[PDB]
């Protein structure tokens with residue numbers, strides 16, 4: 337019930353997402369930074385990096401118009417969303433799936449972590465602080 341655009345969507349806002357989890361305390365943050373100065377950071381308790389990365393995307397999907405460009409450094413989350421499942425065993429993923437269906441156009445790009453990608457580093461620096 338959804339598909340990913342092969343190209344960045346002209347006119348749409350670019351959401352740089354990221355997550356961070358502390359392995360001992362299970363504490364993590366998830367959020368985004370956009371090319372338009374929009375930001376969000378949420379707190380999460382009892383969690384993993386994977387989950388925080390998915391949560392960041394959920395945030396980006398929730399706080400965006402009918403058209404989005406999303407760039408993530410999560411191969412894990414890219415995997416799930418590119419697989420285009422109809423239903424998952426994960427509550428968080430099911431929430432993401434239905435968000436994507438609500439959208440006119442969705443573009444999801446992958447970028448490597450800590451390689452100087454401005455938007456990625458910006459959002460990393462925010463979610464990493466205190467973890």
Ligand SMILES: CCOC(=O)c1c(O)c2cc(Oc3ccc(N(CC)CC)cc3)cnc2n(O)c1=O
Pocket residue numbers: 354355385386409410411449450460464
């Ligand atoms: C600020 C420093 O952060 C980093 O250097 C950093 C990562 O080490 C990192 C690792 C990732 O992939 C993995 C995530 C978790 C695991 N594990 C669970 C299966 C084991 C820990 C393995 C690979 C995915 N994203 C990451 N991001 O965004 C980072 O900023």
Ligand SMILES: [Mn+2]
Pocket residue numbers: 354355389409410449
């Ligand atoms: Mn990451």
Ligand SMILES: [Mn+2]
Pocket residue numbers: 354355356449460464
């Ligand atoms: Mn990071």
